[PDB]
Amino acid sequence: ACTKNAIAQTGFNKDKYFNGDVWYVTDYLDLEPDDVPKRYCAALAAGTASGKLKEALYHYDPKTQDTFYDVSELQVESLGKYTANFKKVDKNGNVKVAVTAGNYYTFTVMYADDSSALIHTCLHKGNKDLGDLYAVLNRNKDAAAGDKVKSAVSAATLEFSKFISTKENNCAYDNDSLKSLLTK
Ligand code: HEM
Secondary structure, three states, X not given: OOOOOOOOOOOOOHHHHOEEEEEEEEEEEEOOHHHXXXXXXXXXXXXXEOOEEEEEEEEEOOXXXXXXXXXXXXXXXXXXXXXXXXXXEOOOOOEEEOOOOOEEEEEEEEEEOOOEEEEEEEEEEOOEEEEEEEEEEEOOOOOOOOHHHHHHXXXXXXXXXXXXXXOOOOOOOOHHHHHHHOOO
């Protein structure tokens, strides 16, 4: 179940966030913690491609080696708050699971600056969801969370100390695929 109406950053700068570059998940918190593994790798690219607002996602379970990419077209609900219907693709953008009704996620950018961000997502895959999932992002895959984003976590009435880090999982990412998937 998802339970939070995440508030987007006041003054969110969409063009900076959606600049075509990659964001790495460095830390995450699911309010239903058993919905996701305790060790995980994830990253995304976010950009406009030929006028269309896009995200490309990468997920990797470093223990099971379960790997998948997704491409999403985002619709705007309000500044910094989106609804994304996804298609599962291979790394080259070939469709494995087409877009469908019931497969979507909400995506809210709660905090962002040039190097860091705090997001919320609620994933729906038919009548299943993956709970309220918060993620701390950085442009540098190895960056420890700094005070701007940790303060944003606090401002969301969350505690950064409860977030699970992705840093001890030997995560390795194909940035080229993420960037190229924005066009697909
Ligand atoms: C950064 C933001 C994220 C977004 C927007 C997001 C989005 C999604 C989407 C769209 C899917 C479905 C993929 C498909 O079936 O084609 C998915 C699945 C999944 N995500 Fe995330 N995700 C994010 C971060 C994470 C993180 C950090 C974890 C942490 C553990 C995670 C764990 C999972 C798992 C375990 C699944 C598989 C669900 C199932 O098998 O049905 N995700 N995610």
